[PDB]
């Protein structure tokens, strides 16, 4: 009935100046095939829309413009704080519907990240490649493409939820081994599962290994001029390594900004690298990859970073899979990134 | 009916070589009053019994010996891992009943700390002054004495629980007399006792204004049984109160080193938090058993355990809690004295 894996295949943006190589569908090829095969609609949700930054991004934008001129209903969702180039986006393509959204009318902290495409209720992409020229060509990204109509329909319902904010156990036995998790809690409705609870549960259930490629694993972030302390994911990682002997490899971005918090977290992680089975490598390249692999049997790909600001306020959809083949493909991706020349051991 | 405060008064050990001063009942005077007024029994629970280390402790030991010679039933509970001077304790006083206890027969990690005296179901002491000459004379300690029979009877039931391990809500919100006990570990709670872990974390999370803590170490990682154990529950409650709710927090902890990478890293983290939040950390080098927590100047917590994972997951102890305004204000002045003491210096390095 339902195909194993839900017809999902991994998508990558591997910049030519970087040493990352693979035979997966590229982000450019993914967006191009979605626009080409489109018959009725194309829905896109991202924090900001800035495709003209690279030549490949402008080509995707022009192909999307062609679809709009040929009757395809195209709607692009972007957060209110990415409204800088809104006038230029609508001037270039008057037939595209650009909508700014504010998902947090109470606190004005939550931001739309979504980071997914969906079209014709048949095809969809989901990952961490925003609708920018950087995410298409020059920034390393990781996502998932699928042409399974039930999965794309799930993403279309997420688009309905996000579009409604215009400014103007199924987790144990998923369908096809693939399921979505959502954020924030006040947008879950009655049926959707909070990504925070799923991620923490998978980290606590880890028996062997935890592999994470994220931007920053820090317990403290700055919610626009104010500090917010949220160590839930940070503690789950640390307690797995120390209390349960789980082998943990963390591939995170470089820190500084004279941030006392990020530096303190760096010294704490470096202190853990000397006595526990916790290894941390750092990358300096621009990298949007948000990847989590547990016991080589569960994979989690999203657009949010494992911090309190994202998982308490921001709006995003996260990809989850327990399909062994898709997990093994993601495991090979992380193994490549771990020993890459752009990943260096944590320095004191 | 029930007296406010449950007839509780603070008890301190202030060594003469230290600058700490107060008008509270001393630990020596407290133990002396318990031994003198004893009519039937005196029950004592501590990790170890080493009273002969100082002259004042040996004097208390001889008074307890005299009580045993006068028909008083004396039982001293000590942990099995404090069995060093057991032979000398029984040679000095053949009429005292010394019992070694192992509260964790499964894992052999939990230790008996109790740190309380109870006698005649009428009088009791509870705090962090063990039955040693150091805790009586040379080591700074803080405890509570009460002669309210219902409170001492509650503490006697804890003694019954611990003695059984021989080697051979509503009542928390409006307590009786504003005083109640919390207990540890979870596998010894029974059906009616409240876990000290949950109460401490709840009080820390409910803090609206101030959090004052005088403990040995506030670290998320300890060495339980040859292995490192990560437990940041109390650590996170403190930090999130300061960062997310703007609570003014003063932490008075002991000095660290031992080339411990974990304790050193935690030191750098706390000092990193001191630069942008209302969190101040001072360090003491003196010998100090004080385990004190004060929340919003309306809740006081005195115990013998340290706020770490080893204690609050394994060890057996009874913790004193009170919301009585008078007793809390007295504990608040104690912390204010300790905070600006000459033996407490701001965190450097």
Domain range for residue B116? 8-346
* Contacts with A227 from chain B: Cβ below 8 Å: 243, 276-277
What the block records as the tokens of A21 is 């190589």
Is A138 touching B (CB cutoff 8 A)?
Answer: no
CB pair distance less than 8 Å for A275 and B261: yes
> How would you classify the pairing of strands A343-345 and B25-26?
unpaired
Nearest to B91 by CA among B126, B65, B116, B127: B65
Q: Residue A213, Cα to own-chain centre: how many angstroms?
A: 11
Q: For B260, what's the count of Cα atoms within 13 Å in the CB-facing half-sphere?
A: 17
* Residue A136, in any domain of the structure: yes
Q: Which helix (H) or strand (E) holds A237?
A: helix A232-244
**How close is the nearest chain A Cα to the Cα of B296, in Å?**
21
CB pair distance less than 8 Å for B269 and A271: no
CB pair distance less than 8 Å for B243 and A228: yes
Q: Residue B217, Cα to own-chain centre: how many angstroms?
A: 14
* Contacts with A261 from chain B: Cβ below 8 Å: 272
What is the end-to-end Cα distance of chain B in Å, rounded? Answer: 54
* Residue A2, in any domain of the structure: no
Go through B58-79 and write b for each residue having 16 or more CB atoms within 10 A of its CB, e for each that does not: bbbbebbbebbeeebebebbbb
Instruction: Give the whole-angstrom CA distance, residue B219 versus residue B212.
Output: 16
Q: Tell me if A160 sits within 8 A of A43, measured CB to CB.
A: no
Instruction: Give the whole-angstrom CA distance, residue A287 versus residue A253.
Output: 8
What the block records as the tokens of A260 is 């006392």
CB pair distance less than 8 Å for A264 and B264: no
Radius of gyration of chain A (CA): 19
Q: Which helix (H) or strand (E) holds A27?
A: helix A27-36
What is the end-to-end Cα distance of chain A in Å, rounded? Answer: 54
* Residue B337, in any domain of the structure: yes
CATH for B157 = 3.30.870.10
* Residue A48, in any domain of the structure: yes
Instruction: Give the whole-angstrom CA distance, residue B154 versus residue B175.
Output: 13
Q: Residue B71, Cα to own-chain centre: how many angstroms?
A: 30
Instruction: Give the whole-angstrom CA distance, residue B20 versus residue B12.
Output: 10
What the block records as the tokens of A191 is 């049926």
> Mutation test of the interface with chain B: which of A248, A263, A272, A312, choosing the one with the most B Cβ atoms within 10 A?
A272
Beta-carbon contacts of A191 under 8 Å, excluding residues fewer than 6 positions away, are none
- The secondary structure of A243-275 as a DSSP string is HH--EEEEEEE---TT-HHHHHHHHHHHHHHTT
Is B243 touching A (CB cutoff 8 A)?
Answer: yes
**How close is the nearest chain B Cα to the Cα of A275, in Å?**
9
Is B107 touching A (CB cutoff 8 A)?
Answer: no
CB pair distance less than 8 Å for A229 and B240: yes
* Partner-chain residue, chosen from A227, A231, A261, that has the shortest CB–CB distance to B232: A231
Instruction: Give the whole-angstrom CA distance, residue A297 versus residue A258.
Output: 38
What the block records as the tokens of B221 is 């990682």
Instruction: Give the whole-angstrom CA distance, residue B327 versus residue A267.
Output: 41
**How close is the nearest chain A Cα to the Cα of B235, in Å?**
11
* Contacts with B223 from chain A: Cβ below 8 Å: none
Instruction: Report the C-alpha dihedral over residues B229, B233, B239, B245, rounded to 10 degrees.
Output: 170
Q: Which of 246-285 (B) contact A at CB < 8 A?
A: 261-262, 264-265, 268-269, 272-273, 275-277
* Residue A142, in any domain of the structure: yes
* Contacts with A245 from chain B: Cβ below 8 Å: none
Handedness of CA A130, A89, A26, A341 (dihedral sign): negative
Instruction: Give the whole-angstrom CA distance, residue B182 versus residue A256.
Output: 44
> Mutation test of the interface with chain A: which of B273, B279, B308, choosing the one with the most A Cβ atoms within 10 A?
B273
Say whether B183 sits in a helix, a strand or coil.
strand
> Apex CA A310: angle with CA A308 and CA A311, to 5°?
65
> Mutation test of the interface with chain B: which of A257, A271, A280, A348, choosing the one with the most B Cβ atoms within 10 A?
A271
What the block records as the tokens of B64 is 């307890």
User: Resolution (in Å) of the shown entry?
Assistant: 2.1
Residue of A nearest to B265 (CA): A268
Work out the number of other CB atoms within 10 angstroms of the CB of residue B168.
4
**How close is the nearest chain A Cα to the Cα of B279, in Å?**
14
Residue linked to tokens 């950087």: A134
Residue of A nearest to B261 (CA): A271
Instruction: Give the whole-angstrom CA distance, residue A289 versus residue A12.
Output: 9
* Residue B83, in any domain of the structure: yes
Instruction: Give the whole-angstrom CA distance, residue B47 versus residue B100.
Output: 9
CB pair distance less than 8 Å for B261 and A274: yes
- The Cα diameter of chain A in Å comes to 62
CB pair distance less than 8 Å for B236 and A235: yes
A2: DSSP letter: P
CB pair distance less than 8 Å for A271 and B277: no
Cis? peptide before B185, omega within 30° of 0: yes
- Residue B265: Cβ-neighbour burial (10 angstroms; 0-12, 13-18, 19+): buried
> Mutation test of the interface with chain B: which of A204, A221, A222, A227, choosing the one with the most B Cβ atoms within 10 A?
A227
Count the domains in chain A: 1
Angle between helix B27-36 and helix B55-69 axes, rounded to 10 deg: 10
Residue of B nearest to A264 (CA): B269
Instruction: Give the whole-angstrom CA distance, residue A35 versus residue A68.
Output: 10
**How close is the nearest chain B Cα to the Cα of A193, in Å?**
26
Helices marked H in chain B: 27-36, 55-69, 86-92, 133, 149-163, 196-205, 233-245, 261-273, 309-314, 325-339
* Residue B137, in any domain of the structure: yes
**How close is the nearest chain B Cα to the Cα of A241, in Å?**
9
What the block records as the tokens of B97 is 């009943």
Q: Tell me if A115 sits within 8 A of A129, measured CB to CB.
A: yes
Instruction: Give the whole-angstrom CA distance, residue B74 versus residue B65.
Output: 9
CB pairs under 8 A between A and B: 49
* Contacts with B239 from chain A: Cβ below 8 Å: 229, 231
> Apex CA A42: angle with CA A38 and CA A43, to 5°?
160
* Residue A1, in any domain of the structure: no
Nearest to A210 by CA among A145, A124, A131, A298: A298
> Cα separations (Å) of B7 from A288, B88, B128, B156?
63, 36, 19, 17
């Amino acid at each position: 009935s339902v195909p194993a894996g839900a017809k999902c295949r991994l998508v990558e943006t591997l910049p030519e100046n970087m040493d990352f190589r693979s035979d997966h569908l590229t982000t450019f090829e993914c967006f191009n095939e979605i626009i080409t095969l489109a018959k009725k609609y194309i829905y896109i949700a991202s924090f900001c829309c800035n495709p003209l930054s690279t030549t490949r991004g402008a080509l995707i934008f022009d192909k999307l413009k062609e679809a709009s001129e040929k009757g395809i209903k195209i709607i692009v969702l972007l957060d209110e704080r990415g409204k800088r180039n809104l006038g230029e986006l609508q001037s270039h393509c008057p037939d595209i519907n650009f909508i700014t959204v504010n998902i947090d009318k109470k606190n004005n902290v939550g931001l739309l990240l979504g980071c997914f495409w969906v079209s014709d209720d048949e095809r969809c992409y989901v990952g961490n490649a925003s609708f920018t020229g950087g995410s298409i060509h020059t920034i390393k990204t990781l996502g998932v493409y699928s042409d399974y109509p039930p999965l794309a329909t799930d993403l279309r319902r997420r688009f309905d939820t996000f579009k409604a904010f215009n400014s103007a156990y199924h987790i144990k036995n998923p369908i096809g081994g693939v399921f979505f998790t959502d954020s924030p809690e006040h947008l879950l409705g009655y049926s959707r599962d909070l990504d925070t609870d799923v991620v923490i549960d998978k980290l606590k259930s880890a028996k062997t290994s935890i592999d994470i490629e994220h931007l920053a694993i820090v317990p403290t972030t700055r919610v626009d001029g104010n500090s917010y302390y949220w160590p839930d994911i940070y503690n789950s990682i640390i307690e797995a390594a120390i209390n349960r002997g789980v082998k943990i490899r963390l591939l995170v971005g470089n820190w500084d900004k004279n941030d006392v918090y990020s530096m303190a977290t760096a010294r704490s992680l470096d202190a853990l690298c000397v006595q526990n089975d916790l290894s941390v490598k750092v990358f300096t390249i621009q990298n949007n990859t948000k990847l989590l692999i547990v016991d080589d049997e569960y994979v989690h790909i999203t657009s949010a970073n494992f911090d309190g600001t994202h998982y308490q306020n921001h709006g995003f959809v996260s990809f989850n899979s327990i399909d062994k083949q898709l997990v093994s493909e993601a495991k090979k991706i992380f193994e490549r990134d771990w020993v890459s020349s752009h990943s260096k051991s944590l320095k004191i």
